[PDB]
Design a protein around this ligand. Structure first.
Ligand SMILES: O=C(C1CCC1)N1C[C@@H]2C[C@@H](CO)O[C@]2(CCO)C1
Length: 130
């Protein structure tokens, strides 16, 4: 229905606003573009599903997300990829891991304060009807 298409258009507006707020934070600059495959050749040998905030913006616009749950699966992938590629004790790996955990915790905190639980349940029920 047009009412359902209006629901999904409000979800995309909400997701673009959250993603922009993460992408302008100086801590998260390292998550704004893909890891460069010419400059980091063993990256895509280890990480089988690369993800970053520019790719997330593209996915919102391609109508890939019907729920905030499916958006948070990609934010969790950005965080898990950084934890698995950079696992060592040295300061450069520890700084990446701390920033990845802060990106995930920040996204979940914005969603807890600003997403209505009944709006999310509506998106889940339209998705499950298709
Ligand atoms: O995993 C990441 C992203 C940082 C936030 C996720 N890498 C892995 C490469 C090795 C690591 C050396 O410190 O830096 C990277 C290359 C420079 O950008 C980026």
């Amino acid at each position: 229905s047009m009412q359902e298409e209006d629901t999904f258009r409000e979800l995309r507006i909400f997701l673009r606003n959250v993603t922009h707020r993460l992408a302008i934070d100086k801590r998260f600059r390292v998550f704004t573009k893909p890891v460069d495959p010419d400059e980091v050749p063993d990256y895509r040998t280890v990480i089988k599903e690369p993800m970053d905030l520019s790719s997330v913006i593209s996915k919102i616009d391609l109508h890939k997300y019907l729920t905030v749950k499916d958006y948070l699966r990609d934010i969790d992938l950005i965080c898990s990829n950084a934890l698995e590629y950079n696992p060592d004790r040295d300061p450069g790996d520890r700084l990446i891991r701390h920033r990845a955990c802060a990106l995930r915790d920040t996204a979940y905190a914005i969603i807890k304060e600003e997403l209505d639980e009944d709006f999310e349940q509506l998106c889940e029920e339209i998705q499950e009807s298709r």
